[PDB]
Amino acid sequence: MGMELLKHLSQRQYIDGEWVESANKNTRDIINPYNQEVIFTVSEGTKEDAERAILAARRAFESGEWSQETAETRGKKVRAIADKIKEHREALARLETLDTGKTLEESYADMDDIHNVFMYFAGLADKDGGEMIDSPIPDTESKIVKEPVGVVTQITPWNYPLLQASWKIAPALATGCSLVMKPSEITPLTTIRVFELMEEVGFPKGTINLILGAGSEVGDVMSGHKEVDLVSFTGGIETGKHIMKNAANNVTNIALELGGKNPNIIFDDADFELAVDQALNGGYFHAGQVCSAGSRILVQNSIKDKFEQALIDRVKKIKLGNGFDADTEMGPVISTEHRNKIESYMDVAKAEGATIAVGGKRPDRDDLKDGLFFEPTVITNCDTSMRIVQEEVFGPVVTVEGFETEQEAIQLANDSIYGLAGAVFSKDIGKAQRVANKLKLGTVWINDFHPLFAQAPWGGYKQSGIGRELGKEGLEEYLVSKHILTNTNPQLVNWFSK
Amino acid sequence: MELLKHLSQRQYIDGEWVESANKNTRDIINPYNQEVIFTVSEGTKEDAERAILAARRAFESGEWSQETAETRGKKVRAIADKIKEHREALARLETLDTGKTLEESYADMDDIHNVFMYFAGLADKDGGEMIDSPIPDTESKIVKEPVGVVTQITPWNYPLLQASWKIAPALATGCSLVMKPSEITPLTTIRVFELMEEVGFPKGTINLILGAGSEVGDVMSGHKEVDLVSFTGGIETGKHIMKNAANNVTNIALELGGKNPNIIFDDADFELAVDQALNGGYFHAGQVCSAGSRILVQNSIKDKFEQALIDRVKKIKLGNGFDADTEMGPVISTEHRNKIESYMDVAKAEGATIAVGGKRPDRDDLKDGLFFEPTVITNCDTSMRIVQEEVFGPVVTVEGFETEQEAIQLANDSIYGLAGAVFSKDIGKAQRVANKLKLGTVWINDFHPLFAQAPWGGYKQSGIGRELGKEGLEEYLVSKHILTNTNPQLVNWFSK
Amino acid sequence: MELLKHLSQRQYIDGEWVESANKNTRDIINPYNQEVIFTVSEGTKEDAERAILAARRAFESGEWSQETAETRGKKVRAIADKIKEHREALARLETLDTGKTLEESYADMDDIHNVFMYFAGLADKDGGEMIDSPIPDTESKIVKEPVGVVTQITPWNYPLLQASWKIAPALATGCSLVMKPSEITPLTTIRVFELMEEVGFPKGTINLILGAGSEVGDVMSGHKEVDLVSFTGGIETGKHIMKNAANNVTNIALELGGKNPNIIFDDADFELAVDQALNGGYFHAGQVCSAGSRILVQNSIKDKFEQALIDRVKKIKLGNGFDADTEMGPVISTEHRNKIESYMDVAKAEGATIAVGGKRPDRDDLKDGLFFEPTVITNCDTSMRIVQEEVFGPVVTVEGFETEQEAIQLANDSIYGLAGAVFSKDIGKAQRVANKLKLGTVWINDFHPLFAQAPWGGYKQSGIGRELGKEGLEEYLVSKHILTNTNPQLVNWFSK
Amino acid sequence: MGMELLKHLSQRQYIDGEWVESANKNTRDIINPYNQEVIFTVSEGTKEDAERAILAARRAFESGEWSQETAETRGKKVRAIADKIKEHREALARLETLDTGKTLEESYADMDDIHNVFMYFAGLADKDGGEMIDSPIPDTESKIVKEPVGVVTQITPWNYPLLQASWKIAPALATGCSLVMKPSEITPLTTIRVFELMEEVGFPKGTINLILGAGSEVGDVMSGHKEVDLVSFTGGIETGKHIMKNAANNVTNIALELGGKNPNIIFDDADFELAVDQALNGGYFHAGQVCSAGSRILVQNSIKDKFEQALIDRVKKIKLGNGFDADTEMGPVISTEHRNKIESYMDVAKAEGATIAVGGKRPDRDDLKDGLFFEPTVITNCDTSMRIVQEEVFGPVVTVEGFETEQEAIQLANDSIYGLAGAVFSKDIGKAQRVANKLKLGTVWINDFHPLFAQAPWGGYKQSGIGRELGKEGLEEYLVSKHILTNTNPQLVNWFSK
Ligand SMILES: NC(=O)c1ccc[n+]([C@@H]2O[C@H](COP(=O)([O-])OP(=O)(O)OC[C@H]3O[C@@H](n4cnc5c(N)ncnc54)[C@H](O)[C@@H]3O)[C@@H](O)[C@H]2O)c1
Ligand code: NA
Ligand code: NA
Ligand code: NA
């Protein structure tokens, strides 16, 4: 991309207008990846809690208190949430840094984007109730009414908790839906806080609900309950496929965003220093734990050697440390299990014949030994047939492959199971545009890397997802169309004998 | 709601008419007399895979996907004209294979011409949007591209009609497609492919597979090269398909029928309601996704309504679809007729009453066909299987309701949400009811109307997505956000 | 449906509060007692020209026109909040200057907040379109840009309300503007400018001219640097403006009032119709573009309706707008009251009957103000001037109609086409009538509703274009088609 | 960018379903500019004829036969017209060439575009009846119905008669309007023919009407009659202003397209031969009698001398002649009066201090002496303050001015009273895009000149017009919005005493 509060922060779930503990009183300790110290303890909900929230969401939806409220008034409420976000910008960002480990700077930028997401949707709320159709049948009035889709379950990941949450909550509330959200069990702090803020705004009982807990325990209820009309999920491909299959039991709509293997295509006529700078940004922000990370670098052969050296020299200078310290450029990874997964990819890489040009291990420096740190890494001498190139590592790691021609870059970039995002660096804009038109990706950046905003749809082709978040299209996931046809001059058909 | 001597018996793959890779065939039957009328290839899963790979290749070549939207529109329109041109033969073919009346079949052909024409005209009307970017010195745009390779599976009730709903938008947007009609009714689909071949499409753009869903079905829904799986049929096959599609996180569009309510208030135009109740339950022997199998009638007029409906149902004329006096043809197959017969047993076992019908007719000219008497089931309630489940036959149930609020609760008390009607002279009341029914389409004082200009699809278990209308075309498109930074500067986040 | 001691008395040009170039002033009056309440600058045509030139300069500088749509939205929203924040004072100010009741004024402020908020939210929602080009190797796009420099002229009936309708979209799209409220009611407009200054806009983006339309009006409509002239007022001034605008082929948006029919069928809710007939004719002493001055009542109930309406009109409470018991305030000025009085003479001379009212009230507390009695004119027809012309006072005419078809012909028999209502419990009939009325807005069983989410404007002589809604914003945008040939080749048409 | 059809072509007006002569039997001889010979004679209508057509249009609109027909069926009729155009492509093109003088190749292309304009609109007909609004007032239904604007008058010019006619007729018929059209008095042949074709398709009596005659006699009736809802005109600025002032008498909607002073901006990094080629195309197709002609060439100083010499050398080779001869590259101007207007501009140019680098006179070659020919011309050493640069000559003439920087090109290009179209020639696409974004023009071409099609709106900023033709926006000129608000739970306000 780009503490006082814990003593007052709620430790519970929010169900049917009440802050409640888990039905079995279980809890979970939340950790700070910088030092692996327990920073807070929260309720660990049960599947019956999730079910009660879903039933409450349904009841609240049928009561019409929110679903039948005027679109304009719903817009005002979503805007009020937007303002509470900005008002508590400092605390929310610190809280997100404490829980996820990324730098405060990155966190401030997230809060800025979150305010804008809510504000964008607040404004879109009353802008489109459907259409009037010119009917082909005389004496009939035809219209398409857009209604809230209904009860929606929302599941978010640990990399950008509040950000991913806003992308779902904003349109759900703007359209009039009822929702049940469950953040990642290892990072629920800002989500808990946003619910407290939403409660201050005021929503009819049951409209919004927060479940806390392991996906392995409550996850299936949220994706397969018959009272759910839409399941929206952002996370890994395996969990996504599972969710979809479970959702199929009730033919429930699904919206998924599953990360990718994002190419960063650098041509020999690119602005060289810019490309190096953006290659670093693409691979190492949030220790590369970004759905849109540019893990797969494609560089034109004529400048590959020059590029590799320049990138490697820079990677050695990346400053690791605590997210609260101003000099920090890269924080730690999210957990022990994720760090181990990354370490295993290093083994797979070497076993396949690739070269760990730099990094590929844990840093030894004293202030970093207690945290979940992993050195920024560059993997060279690799090709498309390797797992390290085809699979999403989701860590501070990037691979470099060379390409000869424009056509080869395109084939290589498109040679993956994914299709989320990517970039093309070239001073020849005409060439960049031809390439962008041929990349099978939801978002293509020309001479930039990471830009994304509420005004435009985000999502993936192929295995990177189904549907879109953000933009008008993102709002549409939360609506359903109904065709009401009125025959103004009804006559008997008299087909059947009388 | 003859040509056989010249009709192809093969599959159409990568620009060529070919037999199954294993030379297997299948006899096609006419439900009026259960006689074999034609024999066609019974494809293999390797044939389906070859068609998908050809679709992918044709899509990457850009011959169709990069053709101008306007020129694609002209081709879709040419198909529209060939449909109208061969209207007679197509309708006879559809009647011979499905058993519905010829009149119903002509109406289908008229709608099919209009579906293609509609999409032909929409083709060049929307390439995307220009976005006002929140980041200075950037240009933001959303380009709408053909979704890619698409697989299309259709049912046996309205084969060509359901096929047009998928083929038209797929071709209008620039996609490549592989279609597979119901194994028991592929005649008109084979014919439409022959017509499309006359129009002329780049090799691999269009492909036709013939065969059992149980043999080639899984490849069409789970192959990695497919970007969208569009299916119309039953709920069980639909759920299976969706699960299979999830293996590659493939988009799915599904339309699965329903338990459509026909709500009749005491202030409805009485004769109109009886007439439309018949139309809702018995067209195509009730083998319609939109059939009004579930009748909800206000208590004050339930007795008057039941008697009037029952008396009419006894007069329904059954017979051959080619005979002009025929009002209702036979059901589609032995298995489907048996399923219906079993529902009659379930109904009685649950305590419902078979007011009329509920059996096979024994009139000489009907004994050789797959006929089943139009039926009315009374004294039932929402807890019964006969009311909750889609029988998809010439059968309807009747339940009473006291108030406006009860009609709504009862109508919405099912797992489905496809379509329904409200009959009342009080339009204001009809509109309040329509706004509360969880259905994709609601008719006020009518039953069955549907057209290319408006989206058709279901809430809840009746489907995912929509067919027809602009929204139907959108299933065939995919959005791409291209963001250009016009004044690129180094971020300088990482040390140098 | 106090602050004066701190309120500015000057014009706002190019980021500065300034006096008229000739130091001339104008006394503003309170129509309740005709006392001078304030004095403001009376600008010159050179002042207007300087404001237009400053608007152009600011537009070319790009400080506002190239700002992100999102940030522009935030600014428009901040204005919306200042409106709500100063709701009490703005409403009192509007009542003091225009004479309408304080309750009517609070409602205006609530609508004004919503107009701005609406537009604030629409700001970043549509930058244009991507077109699927019919020419291979080309990219086609339509970019929506701010139309440019805009002049805005508002009337005296609802000054701030009419001002918001123009200012909001102009600022949301990135335009520069020069506004001039009615010379007799500029108080809330001056206040809104003070509030906009607090929000902060680049120098020259917003400008306020004060003065007689006869002196500065022509400059605002015929200057070559203006891209759009938006006006709300009377038909004669409107036509003049349009002709003047034609000198530079400048876009015009006009809203000119009307002769709004209020159609009441014999199956309408009788007490509701009487109630709405009163509301339609007498809010703001009928000085509303949307006033229902022309009542069309079905013959069968005409006598019953006339007596019921007349009896009510006699009970209408006139008085000071600040007094809670007031139902109707005074008319706006001497000249306007005189224009109304002259219509009474024309009415009688034509053969119509002044059933009630038609004069100034004598009661002591009303003698010092510009009061005029609510009036009902009967026994008239479509050929009369009193029926064809907009009186714009607390006056209504009553005509009878026999059938649905006659109501439609009579309603449409005028040079206007702004708004109207149909009162009938038979909604189906109300809808048929609404579809045939040549009016920009048609209410079914209501009178006056209007809101930012929907376009407002007139057919025929009631105007050109629309205000409010997406369409209202579009008056402030201009389309540019940018076509890039990605594979340029020489045509070689001309010899080498 | 018809010897024997004349024997069967109608010579009359088409009013209220009948081919009729002028009420006063007056006629007009139509001329072929190649040799100035009379080729045909047609009725010269009266103002009472125009009024009768307008009243018939109104009557037909109120009857609902066309305005209440299904949008789909209206689409089919417009499509039928499209097919008749293609069917009679050969004869129409010959007819257009015979009447206007442009080459037969240019005419075939027009017919191809005309088929596409009708087809485009045929397809758009049933695609948008309005919208459903989410009302801020509870218990109300809000909808916007898009209806045909009503009775429309349409006036076209002599340069591309059928083409300009299609742009108006197509959307008018697709939306359900009634229309009265009047082509240029000196070129009515293809318009008469299209009416004959429309009659074969079949439209309710009065829906379509054709008036023939001088603008000075029937023009005012068509722009100031009270029964007209829209006046659509394409032509010169002076007539346009007159029309608008007349339309104001009834506050009638106006759509105007008035030509321009279109810049053709050529940077030093443009593809040089391409720019020379397109500069020729921009200034000399149809003898430069095109609203979109690139009469004003802006060339970067560094290459001005090279460009001028290269353009001049080419202009001398332009082949003038009969439009029916395949070797013809440029035909004659439209009439004596127009040729004279051009000649006068040459005088003005020299008097102002400009140089007639080449051309600037009538050609003497034997086969051209009998026609209305005028040599392709290049005017150099001029500036923005001159009339020859500020005014639309509308002939085979172009001026050349130099610019130093990107910013100067923009200021110069924008320094006119017009704003219709223009081009930017540069291999640096990024620069071309910056320029395009700043030109106050309705259409900007990057590395091309003239492209225009039904799918995109065409029209001008400033004095080049009001409104748009083509595209969805062009169709919208033919629609009017109506907000129908239904209160579903009406209550008495009780404001007034009881
Ligand atoms: N929505 C509708 O319009 C519709 C249509 C037909 C049947 N139905 C319902 O379904 C029941 C009977 O239908 P049916 O079973 O004959 O048809 P079905 O539901 O299986 O649909 C038929 C289509 O699906 C294909 N198919 C079968 N297995 C497949 C697989 N594993 N993968 C992919 N495709 C596969 C078939 O070859 C055929 O093309 C009825 O009880 C009725 O309620 C609904
Ligand atoms: Na005043
Ligand atoms: Na008008
Ligand atoms: Na001529």
Side-chain angles (χ1 to χ4, degrees), chain D residues 113-181:
Chain D
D113 292 342
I114 294 165
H115 169 76
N116 288 338
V117 169
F118 283 104
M119 196 68 66
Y120 175 79
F121 288 106
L124 187 61
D126 64 359
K127 306 301 186 297
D128 182 6
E131 46 184 29
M132 292 299 299
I133 299 295
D134 277 314
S135 180
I137 302 172
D139 300 326
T140 59
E141 183 200 51
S142 174
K143 59 191 179 188
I144 308 307
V145 181
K146 297 284 186 173
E147 303 179 349
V149 68
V151 178
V152 307
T153 50
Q154 300 176 325
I155 299 174
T156 51
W158 50 261
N159 58 342
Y160 295 89
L162 191 56
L163 185 63
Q164 304 304 146
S166 69
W167 288 27
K168 303 180 184 298
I169 289 171
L173 292 177
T175 58
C177 297
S178 287
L179 66 84
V180 181
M181 170 167 291

Side-chain angles (χ1 to χ4, degrees), chain D residues 29-33 39 98-101 158 185-189 334:
Chain D
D29 291 346
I30 303 300
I31 305 176
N32 170 0
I39 46 173
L98 184 69
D99 199 16
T100 70
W158 50 261
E185 57 280 30
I186 61 179
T187 60
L189 309 183
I334 202 62

